Amino acid sequence: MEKYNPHAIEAKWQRFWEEKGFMKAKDLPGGRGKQYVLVMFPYPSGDLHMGHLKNYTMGDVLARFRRMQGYEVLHPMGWDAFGLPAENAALKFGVHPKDWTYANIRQAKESLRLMGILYDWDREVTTCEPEYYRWNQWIFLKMWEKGLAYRAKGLVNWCPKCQTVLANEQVVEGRCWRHEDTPVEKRELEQWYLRITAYAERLLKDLEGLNWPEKVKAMQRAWIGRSEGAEILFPVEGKEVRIPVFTTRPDTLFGATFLVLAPEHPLTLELAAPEKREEVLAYVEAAKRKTEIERQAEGREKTGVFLGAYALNPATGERIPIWTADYVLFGYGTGAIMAVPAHDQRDYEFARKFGLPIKKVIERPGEPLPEPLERAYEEPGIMVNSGPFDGTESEEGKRKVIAWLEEKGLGKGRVTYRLRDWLISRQRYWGTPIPMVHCEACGVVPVPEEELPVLLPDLKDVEDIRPKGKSPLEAHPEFYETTCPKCGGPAKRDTDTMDTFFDSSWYYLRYTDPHNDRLPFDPEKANAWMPVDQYIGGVEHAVLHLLYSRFFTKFLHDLGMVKVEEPFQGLFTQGMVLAWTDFGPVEVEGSVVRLPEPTRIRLEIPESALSLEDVRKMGAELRPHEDGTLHLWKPAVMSKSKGNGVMVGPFVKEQGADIARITILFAAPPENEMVWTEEGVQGAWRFLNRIYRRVAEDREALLETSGVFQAEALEGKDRELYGKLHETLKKVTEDLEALRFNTAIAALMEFLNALYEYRKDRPVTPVYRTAIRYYLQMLFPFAPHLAEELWHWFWPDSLFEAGWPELDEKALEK
Template sequence: MSVYNFKEIEKKWQKKWEENKTFKTVENDKPKYYVLEMFPYPSGKIHMGHVRNYSIGDVVARFMKMKGYNVLHPMGWDAFGLPAENAAIKHGIHPDKWTRENIEEMKEQLKLLGLSYDWDREVATCLPDYYKWTQELFLKFYEKGLAYKKKSFVNWCPSCETVLANEQVVGGECERCDSVVVKKDLEQWYLRITDYAERLLNDIDKLDGWPEKVKIMQKNWIGKSIGAEADFEIEGFNKKLKIFTTRPDTMYGVTYMVLAPEHEYVDELVKGTEYEESVQAFKQKMHHLSEIERTSTDTEKEGLFIGKYAINPLNGKKIPIYIANYVMVDYGTGAIMAVPAHDERDEEFAKKYNLEIIPVIDEDGTMINSEELNGLDAKEGFNKIVEKLENLGIGKKTINYRLRDWLISRQRYWGCPIPIIYCDECGIVPVNKEDLPVKLPTDVEFTGKGQSPLITSKKFTNTTCPKCGKVARREMDTMDTFIDSSWYFLRYIDAKNDKTPFDKDLVGKWMPVDQYIGGVEHAILHLLYSRFFVKVLKDLGMLDFDEPFSNLLTQGMVLKEGAKMSKSKGNVVSPLEIIEKYGADTARLFVLFAAPPERDLDWSEQGVEGCFRFINRVYRLVDELKGFTNVEMNLENPSKEDKKARYVIHSTLKKVTDDISGKFGFNTAISALMELVNEMYKYKELEARKECILKEGIETIITILSPFTPHLAEELWSMIGKEGSISQICWPDYDESALVKDEIEIVIQINGKVRGKLNLSANITKEEMEKEALEDDKIKQLVEGKNIVKIIAVPKKLVNIVVK
């Protein structure tokens, strides 16, 4: 008997798949199925999260191909980003070289897993033939008025002299040098995602194939609020203070106003006054705190009176103006009317600073202390006050969103250059499309100091204006990497197109993605940005659909001893070590069997060994029975054992088909397969076994295995004399007639406790069930001498004998 040599088997079939381009997608008339896993950052090493994510997608892709679909299953690289730049600073390796080497390394590692990717469609977002089109899409956004530049506060490390992304700020300090990070006001590029807030919100209801928790997360992130805008005059100041409130019914209860320390009016209001110095000191203090630190419910409310008063437009009352830590300039208008009687944060602040608290809604929801509105319920008061504001011309009913416009500027090198030129004569000038791509220069210095390494390249920074031809300068910022991942799924469909980002008709044929798979950590930003991009591209006439992903699966994490795997915790399991020791098929089988995909999976070496033993068991079974796989099918005069074996074969096939089809019940499918293997081991030992049933069982086992353990399935398929790749065959239909049982198992209970089981005719009546139960020798002994009160028979399931 041969031995399961996984190293030889896996190497052999990976070579065959590559040589034969087995998984290349070609256009045909079959129904389409686009399955996609979120593409990885090329860090150089795959981890167990990758193994799980991509194994899930591969099962779906292989299964749907065998079900007769034309499957598109591509892979690429989300290749721009900070780690490459940090490597350049730390080790002197150019980001381009570092990234390309990592891509090649990770690509070889992914191939070890036997994933059914069409590598001809591979994209890398850092290559000019990809980011050229990213730049063209940016220009289309700009032409449509959806890209604009404005000043905003960013994280600034005074030691490194550079802007930091939020992820580079850890506990208020720079992750590189541990210096305290401050806020700095810089000009930044934004995309007007808020213009699409209502559509993004409403269309969530179209996403029937998305997890409910993800839809709720997106709704909360967009954060629609219905309320009113109102203008408050400021005493001795010629500008009005605009606020947004969801509770205009409480306006008579306003006792103070709060501005964000960064609000544009603050400096003007305190200039030359006794409050100027303390206000500036407070602002500096706030610049050292993150948004989370400032707005957390656990953070003590802190503020400062700035010496000015606002006027309540409803009653003319003077209201002191404060600045405080809990109001952010990017939320609403950066100013709030504080009603401490009806808001916990305002109440905490008011008590700390001894400010007035005026209740205006009683416990029954009736308005009080509200002049002519006293006695109205709050809902009616809401409408009356909005009406009053509109009549006075100082406010209106309005809708506000928590969602902010998308800040896309990054002051770093390794990103897509923003195709904008600045001219002293013409101002902001977009690069001509025929001059794209604006390529990243190679003559840059990576010092970790200053705003961007791009500044060190004079060839890059100095250019000529496309409009007037005079000396001009390029934009130094690069784009947020979320831009790259907001349209990559479209480029896969037409990856070699050198005329446009993609062909509209071709994309229309394949999109939307039928099944998208990735981590729940991307449930908000990446998915929201992708939805936004698709809606804009539809409005631009480039697409005919407005949602990118029909179905979404967010897989759980791989844990070890209940904790997320991380280098810092020393609990990382290397997939390459597992593949080396047990083989890729074992690694795949374990991550698919150990837990349902949407739940976290706890790593278990014993579980891996168990999967390895199972694979060896299957291999031995097929090797032993491979001589019977050429026999003709002859099911005349089947015995009870024959029928039972065929029942297990076809019920397993039915269960696996149902479990994979949209349910992602891979763990239960594999469990059923294990039971089938056990049954075939029992059946083969029978003297009266039928060789044709052994053949049917073996072929079914191999077919079911193929999406889960593809190398093993290919080898076994070949061992039993089949030609070609098992991935090319049709998924079999189960035999309905084999699922009809002649006999069924009936449970016998006495006073609700199971006391025995009987195999009886599937057509037995209730009366016959009762009779058989009472005539069973064991049951007779148990009820002897007792009074039978009643007998309850549930057809084809159980008999319960109630005795005293």
């Protein structure tokens, strides 16, 4: 008897499914129900591996399942082809970005097609094409008109490797999101920002309902960081003015022993005593000579000048000195702060140096703070020496003080967020050009909507587009030299481009109307497919793409183009696929493993010595090598950098697509990480071989049998099989809906065993034929090629036309 052979049959069914267009999505979902199944589109910066395929196979499983149930399914694929990812990869190998991108796209398509993944390719989008980015420019103009896009000068994050500024979200642990080994630096530049802080409250509040993993919600809440602050008024002794001071710690008001004004604050010179005017003016002048960076410095000695003026602390009614000092920036709050040395380390050091009072008003839980205080206590505690507030917990105390201040007209509550506006401009060539013009007379002028797109100059010299500090477009007068759309005189086009995350913040909407050349998309089409019912992608995008996208959707909603305010109704973050990786030789002596420098560095750990227990605990193992030594192996995230990627092409050629699909889907719960292993591959083979063998063994008998029968007339093992069949259907259906793919496969393995057990006692019967029929249908989402192959041995149409088996509730009773 022949055995399962993946060769040839997979290519046959892949072409069949494509020709039939089973996964083509309707422009507008017929009244039967729709399912928008989306996977995060890839950066075409390299070859796809089984890691990417876990994410994309998960999407295909759900898409096939929903399509079989009768839903109109939108399951699209596209290319996040602009920005740093694509250009950094192309430039590393001295290749032109446009050539590199399309060659990579061609390869990615093959990898997806070879795995039996089906998308509605008619909705494909490539962000680096004018047909797409012209709409990025369109949206940019709308934000400009609505006060959400602006130009400002200030300190920004910069990566010397990318040779461009980076947004706050693109800085991970002080390192570049692309160059994890390169520390980000600071610079002073005038850039473009998107006022995402204008939606901070809605971004925070709208998280509550969301069917997203709590871990992602928590990361976004922490990133936004809503804070309870206050503006407090301090009356100046003998003067009319009451100095407004902003603080994030109103709970420490009773401990404010002095005020500090930024050198540039108008009141610094105005309030200076006559005898102090000379020293104050000199200090203010010296401060201005410094650069933003210089004053934004860290370890510089504390300096300052007493203005010779006093203010009254509104809470204690006590007199406190007013000083001006370099460590206070005018841009922070109101440019004036209340110093609380006991609870602010910066204030502590200044107080200690200039002999200013230090008063404790927040007590530390457990062991009380010592006297004298050797350093500030900045954590929450219990209010003390704070009049009627004594005994109140710090956090709640903030609210109480604010309520008191407002009631007495001494100040007002002021909410702030840690979230900062989004820096979108980049000094790179491969990106969307900013649709703005700089006129010497008019200032910054927007490009007319009708003139879009503002095409990227076709630079062919690779050495030319390479980033050296300024935007490559700054060396092309043929591009920027233009006329002002307002006055008509000579002007200069903006030379910076939009970061890649701009493109990806709305691509899922373009999929609903990929060919519209008048609007980014037609509201009617988008509102029919939105919101995304199930989005699948990595958690690494928690405060990047997953945050920016919500902002874009809320903005487009406010424009009246999108009905929903949340783009992804359901989000599932898949665990990473890992691969056993050799980190190098080690030496063992007793319970201690010595790690030579090369090995330690590859492992990226500080230990030069690990115990055998440490090695086990981190999931590593020591394997004898032919070089006569022992090497330390450990599962590492599958990626190019690690050089441990398992590519689709070579694997499916030697093994097969369904084998790879089962290996991935059965390894572990999809939300968890998994390790790609030979044992897993062998397991996939065993399962597929066992399915084929069961059907082949009964092929002849099945052909001469009808699948019609009366359930209530079944007896013995026949009735038992009928019950197990429906128990299995229910389990597999519910598991698929919750993306519990590995357990759905376990249920099919279990039911397959039941089929073998059944046949030991019973012959091929009508109920058995129906069980086989239902089995191939339930198998289709997981191993489609084999399911389609066996299905055709007995039935005419495709599994996509068979629908999803109907559950028999009564069969579940008892």
